Design a protein around this ligand. Structure first.
Ligand code: JAW
Ligand code: JAW
Lengths: 213, 214
């Protein structure tokens, strides 16, 4: 069983998590979404301020985050902070996190979260700053959705690129399913599929096989 | 001015990003995101979208006749057809920049073990097709990848927003739970601040992303 808390200033953006939806329905995992502004005290509910040292944009204040995480996290929590400057989130990471009791995902907006939030949390719990890929999102919420989906499907009770797949009809718009796939010859099918995967990995992801680019 | 059509068997997944678009950008006709239920193009009363894989194996494959009809209706010769797949080329910020100038993106969201390959192969004979992965992890389907792609692309579209890793950022208060903001940031020596940030970036990139440094 796993508990996931997501903290965000846009809780409505996390609704796609209800599809993970079937997983929540079957009660293996519970996912709860929290509005960060719940932990503000001024009437303007401010969560951001200009950066020390200058630069464009705003930084999320540590005070509000600290109060939220104080309430939501325990010492057993794995605190996950999406950020383009994070360690890479990979399938290995997803396997690792799949056996955790409690994930808390802190979703940043603006130019990021004051670094002391993660630093303070790390004195009490395990903290993981991670990137889901080399592109810029408008905030951590889409990353949270990717992480949740990748992790939940590995929870107990829920190399080379995959080649092309085919299903019926065997001829469509004058394009035939590769004949070997209709042959029923398991050895020849396995071989053809390995060759397809090789071509595809070399072409699209040569890095996976230890080649440049 | 970009139109994005997304085709999926879970259209509700994409509704929050649809509603997150700034009214001003929609009012100015800079952007439109439309989401379509793939089952609109099914042929049978059971609204079947998948079938068993030729050659055997686990899971199911999405039917080419259904996808073929959907894309026939939605795509034109000017369309850039995006197909999220773990077997794709990597989607990066460079990709997002390239696609941000397109008039029409169509994102085909697959489930199970993928879409019959003839769908993309046939589409590629009359439009540009891009199979892409958003990272090295497995999702249940393409919807979360579509969300990522839509966000990354649209924030580059002129209007809709109205190397090395970045280092740490700080804001008020100057002291918090025993941790001080690095005094250099308060120094008013902006050449020194820039050099400090550069070194923080170098150290963080070495620690977290050595791949970025050859
Ligand atoms: N690529 C990422 O993982 C990423 C990019 C931008 C972001 N902004 C807030 C969180 C976040 C994550
Ligand atoms: N990592 C990806 O981009 C990814 C993983 C699994 C998927 N299933 C369907 C589309 C898709 C994309």
């Amino acid at each position: 069983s796993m508990k996931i808390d997501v903290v965000t200033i846009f809780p409505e953006y996390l609704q796609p998590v209800r599809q993970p939806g079937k997983a929540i329905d079957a009660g293996l995992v519970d996912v709860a979404v929290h509005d960060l502004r719940r932990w503000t005290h001024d009437v303007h509910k401010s969560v951001d301020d200009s950066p020390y040292g200058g630069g464009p944009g705003m930084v999320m204040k540590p005070t509000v985050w600290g109060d939220a995480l104080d309430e939501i996290c325990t010492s057993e929590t794995l605190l996950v902070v999406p950020t383009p400057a994070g360690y890479p989130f990979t399938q290995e990471t997803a396997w690792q996190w799949s056996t955790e009791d409690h994930l808390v995902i802190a979703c940043g907006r603006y130019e990021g979260i004051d670094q002391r939030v993660a630093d303070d949390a790390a004195t009490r719990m395990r903290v993981r700053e991670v990137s889901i890929g080399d592109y810029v999102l408008n905030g951590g919420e889409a990353a949270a959705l990717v992480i949740i989906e990748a992790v939940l499907r590995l929870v107990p009770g829920v190399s080379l690129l995959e080649g092309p797949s085919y299903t019926r009809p065997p001829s469509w718009r004058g394009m035939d399913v590769p004949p070997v796939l209709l042959s029923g010859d398991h050895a020849k099918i396995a071989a053809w599929r390995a060759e397809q995967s090789r071509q595809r990995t070399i072409e699209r992801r040569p890095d996976l096989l230890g080649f440049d680019s």
